[PDB]
Ligand binder design. Structure first.
Ligand SMILES: C[C@@H](O)[C@@H](C(=O)O)[C@H]1CC(SCCNC=N)=C(C(=O)O)N1
Ligand SMILES: [Zn+2]
Ligand SMILES: [Zn+2]
Length: 228
């Protein structure tokens, strides 16, 4: 683990890093939020911002120092603060940002800054390639409504890594966390759909825990079963 400012960076694979930022919430303590950094050829790709614009700027600063390649694009997995909180930092730096069309539509109501481009998805959940230009190893999948109506997920092609965001919780988790915006009826099916979308992924990266095995997906699904 590497510390850079208030952020921590961990290499998960030769070309993949996890970024972690913290937000102190009064009465509840500091909460960690994870994202991904992917090196693809002569460019870098980001998945999710940090909690804030300042923290996100630090991600770009670490990238400059540790990777020294231009950041080509970023993808945010839904319209909540821990995933979209630092959109300004990305846009200030001239980085093209992509999100679920629904996330961009919800963003203003959520107090978030919308991404600059919209992803749309097929009936089977896979992104329509036309809306996801030059994503390299990033394979984006909409598993259906769960944590939120708009949550999307990301696999890293050519690695054992898949990113479930706030949809997937780790196998040690006691609850499904914040269900304030959740679709409790479809949550279980969506978690399982993600598992089926990336059947070979063995390392599951998520928003609020260290990377886990596929057990995180199944354990989440089974916790969600009880919500019905
Ligand atoms: C604060 C907001 O961004 C919230 C969300 O996205 O729903 C953050 C905080 C949280 S709570 C973190 C884990 N909580 C466990 N009780 C989650 C989450 O559950 O995914 N995401
Ligand atoms: Zn959320
Ligand atoms: Zn979260």
């Amino acid at each position: 683990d590497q510390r850079f400012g208030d952020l921590v960076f961990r290499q998960l694979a030769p070309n993949v890093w996890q970024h972690t930022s913290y937000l102190d919430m009064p009465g509840f303590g500091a909460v960690a939020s994870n994202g991904l950094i992917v090196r693809d050829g002569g460019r870098v790709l980001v998945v999710d911002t940090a909690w804030t614009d300042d923290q996100t700027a630090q991600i770009l600063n670490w990238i400059k120092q540790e990777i020294n390649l231009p950041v080509a694009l970023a993808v945010v997995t839904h319209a909540h603060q821990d995933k979209m909180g630092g959109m300004d930092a990305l846009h200030a730096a001239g980085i093209a940002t992509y999100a679920n069309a629904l996330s961009n539509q919800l963003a203003p109501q959520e107090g978030m800054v919308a991404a600059q481009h919209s992803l749309t998805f097929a009936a089977n959940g896979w992104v329509e390639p036309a809306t996801a230009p030059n994503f390299g190893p990033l394979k984006v999948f909409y598993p259906g409504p769960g944590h939120t109506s708009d949550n999307i997920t990301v696999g890293i092609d050519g690695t054992d890594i898949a990113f479930g965001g706030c949809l997937i919780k780790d196998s040690k988790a006691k609850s499904l966390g914040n269900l304030g915006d959740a679709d409790t009826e479809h949550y279980a099916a969506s978690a399982r759909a993600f598992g089926a979308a990336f059947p070979k992924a063995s390392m599951i990266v998520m928003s609020h825990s260290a990377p886990d095995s596929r057990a995180a997906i199944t354990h989440t699904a089974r916790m969600a079963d009880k919500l019905r």
